[PDB]
Design a protein around this ligand. Structure first.
Ligand SMILES: Nc1nc2c(ncn2[C@@H]2O[C@H](COP(=O)(O)O)[C@@H](O)[C@H]2O)c(=O)[nH]1
Length: 258
């Protein structure tokens, strides 16, 4: 079979899909499956992907309902023990896939690494209940999840077009999926959405973790942890809902130590 499966969603990615695939095919010490899920690109995207044409490259090209819909197609078709997602304008760093296989050999379900964005490290958080009241704890492209992890968590929720990665990881946390965080850069993200749109999805994700929360309550927790608002009502929300979930108590204790 394969150690790794790399799912690459693409739509009009002729500028960079080459560099993307180069960073995957040069990975040493691993048998890797590449699944390019194209959304019906009208440009030279498909012909560039076919230029490589390795025996381990599968090309899907058809209209889809978004990045996460295309991801879901690739994940379902993956045959490698560990599955990563790489944007066509991202690149893995050298030796990353071998590190993923190394950690996967010891039984870890999720292997996540650091993320380089415009020459700076992504400000990652911890894979822990506190993440449930914030965003995705690490860069999504820096994440690798085993077949078993996906079988037990499921696919990405297409109702979330921006924060579906955070919503999947929060479910992985809620599912008690093991995670190893590697303090090394896995991915170099490419920088070339309306804030309210993201804030709306983030709050909705938080409510999906803790349905007993209203919109403003989730937003107040979001703004409180993110530093955009005051944290005077944090104690009221713990008492108001503490009895509902120990996870919610744990998430608040980790996030707001005072
Ligand atoms: N298959 C598919 N890929 C998409 C769609 N929209 C964006 N992508 C791809 O998903 C990745 C997103 O990276 P971005 O360019 O947004 O940083 C890129 O590889 C981009 O081409 C889509 O609707 N369908």
């Amino acid at each position: 079979e394969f150690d790794i499966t790399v799912v690459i969603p693409t739509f009009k990615a002729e500028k960079t899909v080459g560099q993307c695939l180069e960073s995957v095919l040069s990975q040493q010490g691993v048998s890797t499956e590449i699944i390019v899920v194209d959304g019906g690109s009208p440009d030279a995207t498909i012909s560039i992907v076919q230029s490589f044409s390795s025996t381990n490259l599968t090309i899907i090209s058809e209209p889809d309902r978004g990045i996460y819909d295309a991801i879901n197609k690739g994940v379902s078709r993956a045959q490698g023990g560990m599955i990563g997602v790489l944007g066509a304008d991202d690149v893995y760093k050298p030796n990353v896939l071998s590190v993923v296989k190394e950690n996967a050999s010891r039984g870890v379900e999720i292997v996540a690494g650091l993320t380089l964005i415009d020459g700076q490290l992504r400000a990652d958080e911890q894979y822990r209940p506190a993440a449930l009241i914030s965003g995705i704890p690490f860069g999504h492209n820096a994440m690798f999840a085993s077949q078993e992890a996906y079988r037990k968590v499921g696919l990405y929720d297409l109702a979330y077009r921006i924060c579906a990665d955070a919503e999947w990881v929060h479910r992985a946390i809620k599912s008690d999926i093991s995670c190893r965080k590697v303090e090394q850069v896995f991915v170099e993200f490419g920088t070339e959405s309306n804030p309210e749109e993201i804030i709306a999805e983030a709050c909705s994700v938080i409510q999906r973790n803790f349905p007993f929360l209203l919109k403003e309550e989730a937003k107040y927790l979001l703004y409180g942890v993110r530093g955009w608002g005051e944290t005077s009502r944090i104690e009221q929300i713990l008492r108001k809902y503490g009895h509902e979930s120990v996870l919610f108590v744990t998430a608040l204790q980790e996030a707001f130590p005072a």
